[PDB]
Amino acid sequence: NISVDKVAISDGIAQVDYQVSNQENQAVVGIPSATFIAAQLLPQGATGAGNSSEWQHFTSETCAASCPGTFVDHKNGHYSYRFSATFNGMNGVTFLSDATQRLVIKIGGDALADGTVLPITNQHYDWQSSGNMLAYTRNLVSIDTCNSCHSNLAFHGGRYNQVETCVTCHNSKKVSNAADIFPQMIHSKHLTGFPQSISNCQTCHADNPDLADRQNWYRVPTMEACGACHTQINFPAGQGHPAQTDNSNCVACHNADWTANVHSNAAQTSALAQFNASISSASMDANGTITVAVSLTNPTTGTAYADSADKLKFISDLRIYANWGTSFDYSSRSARSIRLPESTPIAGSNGTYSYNISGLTVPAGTESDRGGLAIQGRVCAKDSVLVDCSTELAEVLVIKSSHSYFNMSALTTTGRREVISNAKCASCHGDQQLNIHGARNDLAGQCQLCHNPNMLADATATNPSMTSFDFKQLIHGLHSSQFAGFEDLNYPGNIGNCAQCHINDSTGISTVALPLNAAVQPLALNNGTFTSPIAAVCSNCHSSDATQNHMRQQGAVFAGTKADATAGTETCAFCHGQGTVADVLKVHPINKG
Numbered sequence: 001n002i003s004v005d006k007v008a009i010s011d012g013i014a015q016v017d018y019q020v021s022n023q024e025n026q027a028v029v030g031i032p033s034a035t036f037i038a039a040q041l042l043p044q045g046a047t048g049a050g051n052s053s054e055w056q057h058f059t060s061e062t063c064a065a066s067c068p069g070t071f072v073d074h075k076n077g078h079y080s081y082r083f084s085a086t087f088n089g090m091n092g093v094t095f096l097s098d099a100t101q102r103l104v105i106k107i108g109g110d111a112l113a114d115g116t117v118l119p120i121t122n123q124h125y126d127w128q129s130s131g132n133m134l135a136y137t138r139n140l141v142s143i144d145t146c147n148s149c150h151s152n153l154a155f156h157g158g159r160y161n162q163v164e165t166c167v168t169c170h171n172s173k174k175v176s177n178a179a180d181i182f183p184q185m186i187h188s189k190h191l192t193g194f195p196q197s198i199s200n201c202q203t204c205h206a207d208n209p210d211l212a213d214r215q216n217w218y219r220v221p222t223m224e225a226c227g228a229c230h231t232q233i234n235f236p237a238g239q240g241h242p243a244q245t246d247n248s249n250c251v252a253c254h255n256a257d258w259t260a261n262v263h264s265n266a267a268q269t270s271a272l273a274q275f276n277a278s279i280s281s282a283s284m285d286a287n288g289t290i291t292v293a294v295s296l297t298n299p300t301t302g303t304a305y306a307d308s309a310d311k312l313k314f315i316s317d318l319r320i321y322a323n324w325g326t327s328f329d330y331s332s333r334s335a336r337s338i339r340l341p342e343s344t345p346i347a348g349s350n351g352t353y354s355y356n357i358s359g360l361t362v363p364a365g366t367e368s369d370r371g372g373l374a375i376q377g378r379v380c381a382k383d384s385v386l387v388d389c390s391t392e393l394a395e396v397l398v399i400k401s402s403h404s405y406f407n408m409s410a411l412t413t414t415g416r417r418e419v420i421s422n423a424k425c426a427s428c429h430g431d432q433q434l435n436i437h438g439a440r441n442d443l444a445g446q447c448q449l450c451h452n453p454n455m456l457a458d459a460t461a462t463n464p465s466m467t468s469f470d471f472k473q474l475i476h477g478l479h480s481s482q483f484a485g486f487e488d489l490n491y492p493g494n495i496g497n498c499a500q501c502h503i504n505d506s507t508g509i510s511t512v513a514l515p516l517n518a519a520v521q522p523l524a525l526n527n528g529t530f531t532s533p534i535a536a537v538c539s540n541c542h543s544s545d546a547t548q549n550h551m552r553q554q555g556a557v558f559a560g561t562k563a564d565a566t567a568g569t570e571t572c573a574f575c576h577g578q579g580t581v582a583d584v585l586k587v588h589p590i591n592k593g
């Protein structure tokens with residue numbers, strides 16, 4: 001809500017409440033009815049005393065009989081149509097300061113005047129002063145970068161607070177506390193359960209010209225803020241750090257470069273930036289033996305490592321994993337592999353050597369299908385460079401895994417279908433920091449080399465296909481805190497928001513109402529039994545006692561796995577179908593990146 005103006009005589013009298021509205025085309029006249037909403041604040045920057053910007057809350061809260069100068073929408077001052085009003089009193093708990101910044105906000109959750117009826121909630125701020133440009137500010141961080149992991153954010157019965165901000169109530173003045181002051185608080189909350197490493201600052205402290213003030217997560221060291229993560233330290237007592245009663249000396253020692261570096265990982269990344277392992281070519285014979293050619297190089301500068309991996313001292317580990325059957329999600333739950341340093345090559349010279357992976361399972365009718373490869377490794381580094389893995393105080397970093405797609409004769413660029421992307425997962429995990437099994441971190445592939453339908457699922461369990469280590473099952477299941485060993489794991493965003501993980505198949509999202517080649521073997525561990533292709537996936541986010549199984553054709557457990565596969569085509573899709581239908585994607589909340 002672009003607004004106007006500051007009311008200076010002798011009270012708050014907010015004069016406009018529109019029209020950016022809730023949701024629609026916009027630029028349409030609106031009517032402010034009929035609930036909520038208001039709050040005011042005063043910040044001083046660093047005048048008291050020698051530390052940081054502070055907000056201060058003027059009384060705004062619950063009420064019984066409908067009133068102006070607090071939290072509600074009633075016996076206020078004249079409001080209607082567009083240009084509203086208005087506050088009572090001024091300096092309640094604190095006191096107004098000439099030549100200072102201040103804060104205003106407005107939200108709208110509505111049972112409307114029978115004219116439209118909506119929405120959930122919608123807020124926007126207006127920071128004020130007594131008639132001049134803008135002295136100083138505290139624009140630390142916007143909510144959208146928060147939404148990457150949360151999609152939408154709205155605490156307190158979703159009442160607050162779309163956008164910015166909550167710095168209003170979460171002050172020393174309003175909250176009690178402790179510590180529910182914004183920096184103090186949200187650090188402590190994300191201290192554990194955070195996907196990425198806590199030391200990743202820009203994941204929240206994103207870079208943004210719109211926010212002139214910060215440049216701050218490392219400009220302004222303070223007990224309360226830094227101590228939130230660094231808990232084992234009691235400053236005033238000298239526990240774990242030299243005693244400090246205040247934060248008047250923090251900065252003298254903790255310069256910006258220092259605090260910005262200690263949390264940075266530039267050293268790690270520059271070391272890794274000096275090594276790359278790519279599969280230059282590949283092929284396979286009829287019975288199932290792969291021949292790979294590996295080319296080690298320095299990605300920057302781009303020159304070759306003439307010697308083979310087994311002679312490069314800085315390599316801690318480097319493996320390739322492979323499997324066959326891209327069109328049907330592979331033929332084994334366990335991919336074959338080789339540890340390159342642990343094996344002398346067949347042929348090679350000058351930065352490129354051939355090895356061969358054997359023991360792959362090639363079912364008959366699938367001689368012309370595609371396979372899958374995935375590099376995996378660790379290198380020892382120290383002080384931003386690679387070093388002999390036996391050097392003192394060396395650290396073991398993890399190669400960014402990668403995958404090439406296989407073909408009986410030579411590498412192919414097409415490969416197995418793309419259901420998700422490292423991009424989409426990084427919006428919570430990072431690209432590509434999430435490491436499982438030590439060194440595996442590719443999600444656009446690799447994981448499925450083992451996490452495929454070949455992964456058995458418990459028939460005994462009342463649980464429907466949430467025992468299958470199939471990638472789709474595993475992922476959906478654990479990010480729902482339902483998968484075994486993954487209970488009580490709090491998932492930030494909307495579980496139902498498909499957009500986060502999924503992606504486009506040249507058209508709609510990769511949850512196309514009709515799968516392309518999702519071979520379905522969802523029930524094993526008992527083996528004999530199997531389950532419908534589409535019912536397979538929906539039974540985790542629409543779990544048990546149900547459906548009835550509301551089971552129309554194809555829908556079922558075992559039936560010769562033929563009546564299961566797939567069997568024919570079935571209306572189960574046509575009904576919940578892509579083209580504008582009685583379900584498809586309208587049924588799920590999905591947004592754009």
Ligand code: HEC
Pocket residue numbers: 141143145146147148149150155186189190192193194195196203204427428490491492
């Ligand atoms: C991904 C790295 C996230 C970023 C970016 C933000 N949040 Fe988050 N949030 C995330 C996780 C994994 C969790 C829970 C972990 C756990 O073990 O509890 C949360 C939780 C919250 C909460 C709820 C706290 C509660 O007690 O329920 C809040 C209010 C919250 N986070 C706020 C918040 C804000 C304001 C963010 C932008 C600055 C933000 N989060 C970013 C994951 C991630």
Ligand code: HEC
Pocket residue numbers: 153154155156160161162165166168169170174175176177178180
């Ligand atoms: C004033 C209307 C507030 C707004 C705006 C926001 N919060 Fe709040 N919250 C408020 C109070 C008075 C309290 C507790 C008071 C006390 O003395 O303890 C809280 C509490 C929280 C908590 C945890 C404690 C709890 O009672 O649940 C969290 C995690 C929290 N608040 C988060 C939060 C976020 C992320 C906000 C911006 C979207 C936000 N609050 C705004 C009052 C107010």
Ligand code: HEC
Pocket residue numbers: 052053138139140141165167182183186187190198199200201202203204205216217218220221222225226259263
């Ligand atoms: C999301 C969970 C964050 C993480 C991860 C980090 N920071 Fe943070 N920080 C975050 C918020 C929402 C706020 C307050 C926002 C507001 O408008 O008040 C802060 C605050 C700080 C501060 C205080 C700065 C000031 O000017 O007072 C500091 C010094 C700070 N944060 C440091 C910091 C560092 C070094 C981080 C990486 C280790 C870091 N934070 C992570 C959100 C999040």
Ligand code: HEC
Pocket residue numbers: 187197198199200217218220221222225226227228229230254259262263
């Ligand atoms: C959570 C978002 C944090 C906040 C807020 C602050 N720090 Fe931190 N710090 C955090 C992590 C995850 C780490 C590990 C570093 C690593 O290499 O893994 C650190 C580390 C430090 C250190 C190094 C101490 C050591 O034992 O080697 C220092 C000196 C440090 N951090 C300082 C510091 C300051 C001054 C902060 C406020 C501006 C601060 N940290 C906030 C996580 C978080």
Ligand code: HEC
Pocket residue numbers: 221222223224226227230233235241242244246247248249250251252253254
């Ligand atoms: C010089 C006398 C300092 C003053 C004043 C402050 N800090 Fe300090 N700090 C100093 C040193 C030499 C170190 C060791 C760091 C290392 O890598 O060995 C530290 C450590 C910290 C840390 C690290 C936390 C951890 O768990 O390791 C933090 C978070 C930190 N310091 C913050 C901090 C604060 C809040 C201060 C004001 C109260 C402060 N420092 C003052 C040197 C000095």
Ligand code: HEC
Pocket residue numbers: 148149150193194195420424425426427428429434436443475479489490491492493494500501
């Ligand atoms: C934010 C909405 C997320 C998206 C996008 C993705 N994941 Fe996630 N995942 C998220 C959180 C907050 C956690 C915390 C778990 C914990 O115990 O802290 C996780 C966890 C995982 C794990 C577990 C790893 C382990 O426990 O060792 C895995 C393997 C994982 N996530 C994978 C994964 C994939 C493949 C994603 C893209 C499809 C993905 N995640 C996205 C939150 C979020």
Ligand code: HEC
Pocket residue numbers: 321333334335435436437440441442443446447448449450451469
């Ligand atoms: C074969 C070489 C595998 C590849 C490649 C990946 N995974 Fe894995 N994983 C594999 C098996 C056989 C199992 C179950 C039994 C076991 O040996 O551990 C798992 C288990 C998991 C789990 C949960 C178990 C745990 O470690 O706590 C997760 C969260 C998981 N797998 C995820 C995962 C990811 C993200 C992968 C790509 C980075 C990946 N796996 C590859 C075998 C294999």
Ligand code: HEC
Pocket residue numbers: 417419420448471472475476479495496497498499500501502510511512515516517518537541588
């Ligand atoms: C991150 C936790 C995700 C969420 C949220 C949703 N999906 Fe997902 N899905 C995710 C992964 C990592 C996979 C693995 C598939 C693979 O081979 O890598 C899947 C799989 C599916 C599929 C299979 C489709 C196909 O293989 O062609 C479907 C149909 C599917 N998921 C549906 C779906 C829907 C409707 C979602 C929103 C409610 C949704 N998923 C969320 C990761 C994640």
Ligand code: HEC
Pocket residue numbers: 476495496534537538540541542576583587588
């Ligand atoms: C996890 C990623 C899911 C997948 C896979 C599927 N859906 Fe789903 N959907 C999911 C959740 C967590 C919810 C919440 C429903 C609620 O009431 O809160 C939904 C919602 C639906 C519904 C609504 C049914 C009801 O609420 O009674 C339908 C009809 C629906 N989704 C359709 C649907 C279909 C046909 C799926 C297979 C193609 C499917 N969903 C998968 C999460 C997930």
Ligand code: HEC
Pocket residue numbers: 534535538542546547549550551552553554555556571572573575576582583
């Ligand atoms: C047309 C007759 C359909 C067939 C065939 C299938 N589904 Fe369906 N389903 C359809 C509608 C119009 C609805 C209403 C949902 C709503 O929110 O209005 C549903 C409902 C479901 C649900 C919801 C169950 C719950 O929330 O508890 C589920 C889980 C579901 N449908 C799954 C499902 C499966 C697996 C199907 C193939 C066996 C299937 N449906 C077929 C329309 C139709």
Ligand SMILES: [Ca+2]
Pocket residue numbers: 207208209210211212213214215
């Ligand atoms: Ca900036």
